Design a protein around this ligand. Structure first.
Ligand SMILES: [K+]
Ligand SMILES: [K+]
Ligand SMILES: [Zn+2]
Ligand SMILES: [Zn+2]
Length: 386
């Protein structure tokens, strides 16, 4: 009801992260992703309804709440910064007579993960500080929820590893920052990008204060990045607080709405309520959308299903919900998916009766995959027991 209680995060800083080969056809994590989304938000009348924010750069201190000092200095600084770094640090960055040459002749961290020598450090720090900033507002309660239209994505970047199009784990940084500023708070991270958020899982693996729930294509270790099997529940104090909805059995039958709606009904929502989070962050990749062919997906989740998933998560944590863009590169599918999530965020309700496709039962691979989730997590969660 209260107006402008929903924020949107976007800035053109983030468009500059582009290979120097100048060819979007070999580089699916391109600037077009976030720009094509931004305008969809206007043409449909949603931007006006939101507290729009530009974001800011994360400080090196914020980055270090998740990443090593060497990763941070590598990807968070520029030669030559107005930066006051001590000479030993300066010397360390000289030992890396490093870089990787891409087949296209541009610089990369690996074949897929490109580096612009002028602009990528600024764009990565900007994605991370924007999600941190959109989130702080929601935590203060100065906003109800919000949506971060950020790139590059974050959820594959681990403590000292950039990979998978990601350099800093924007969501994990926001999580840590939030927790610094509100003692004893409990944070739920829901990751619905089709790939396992290996960096997020690892950041929080031994930490009972954060519950991580990933839904991802897994298929017995044979989908990028190979990580995030169902038996990975957390370790030490954090045992039970890592939930991998690891989908097995491949692309046949089709994996789409009935499976995702079932995963929410049976696993995400009940465990989430039992955890009872102070705030919910979503790694909201749209690469499980209809529109991604075999290699980068194969799934058929729809805009409305993403909308309805957003809408259910709003029942949690007093409504404190922040989505951050992760993966997904088919432009119409990511734009449809974002719009749906954004309507949903404003207080629009989706009608589950409206879709005939949602009368279909989840396929058996899905059921099986969930049975394994259940069987594993019955040890830790009451709603999973018996
Ligand atoms: K995921
Ligand atoms: K955890
Ligand atoms: Zn290139
Ligand atoms: Zn992905």
């Amino acid at each position: 009801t209260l107006p402008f209680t929903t924020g949107l995060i976007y800035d053109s800083v983030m468009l500059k992260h582009q290979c120097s080969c100048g060819d979007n056809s070999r580089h699916p994590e391109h600037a077009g992703r976030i720009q094509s989304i931004w305008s969809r938000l206007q043409e449909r009348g949603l931007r006006s309804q939101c507290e729009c924010l530009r974001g800011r750069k994360a400080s090196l201190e914020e980055l270090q709440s998740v990443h090593s000092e060497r990763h941070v200095l590598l990807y968070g600084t520029n030669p030559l910064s107005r930066l006051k770094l001590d000479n030993g640090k300066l010397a360390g960055l000289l030992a890396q007579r490093m870089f990787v040459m891409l087949p296209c002749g541009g610089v990369g961290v690996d074949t897929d993960t490109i580096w612009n020598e002028l602009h990528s450090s600024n764009a990565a720090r900007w994605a991370a500080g924007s999600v941190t900033d959109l989130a702080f507002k929601v935590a203060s309660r100065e906003l109800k929820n919000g949506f971060a239209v950020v790139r590059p994505p974050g959820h594959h970047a681990d403590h000292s590893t950039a990979m998978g199009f990601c350099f800093f784990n924007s969501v994990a940084i926001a999580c840590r920052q939030l927790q610094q500023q509100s003692k004893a708070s409990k944070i739920l991270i829901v990751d619905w990008d089709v790939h396992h958020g290996n960096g997020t899982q690892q950041t929080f693996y031994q930490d009972p204060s954060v519950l991580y729930i990933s839904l991802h294509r897994h298929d017995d270790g044979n989908f990028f990045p190979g990580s995030g099997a169902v038996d990975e529940v957390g370790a030490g104090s954090g045992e039970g607080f890592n939930v991998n909805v690891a989908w097995a059995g491949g692309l046949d039958p089709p994996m789409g709405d009935p499976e995702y709606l079932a995963a929410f009904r049976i696993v995400v929502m009940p465990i989430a309520r039992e955890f009872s989070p102070d705030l919910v962050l979503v790694s909201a990749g749209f690469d499980a959308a209809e529109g991604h062919p075999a290699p980068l997906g194969g799934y058929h989740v729809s805009a409305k299903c993403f909308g309805y998933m957003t809408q259910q998560l709003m029942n949690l944590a007093g409504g404190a919900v922040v989505l951050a863009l992760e993966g997904g590169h088919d432009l119409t599918a990511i734009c449809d998916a974002s719009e749906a999530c954004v309507a949903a965020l404003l207080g629009n309700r989706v009608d589950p009766l409206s879709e005939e496709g949602w009368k279909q039962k989840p396929n058996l691979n899905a059921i099986r995959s969930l049975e394994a989730v259940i069987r594993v997590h019955s040890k830790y969660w009451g709603c999973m027991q018996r």
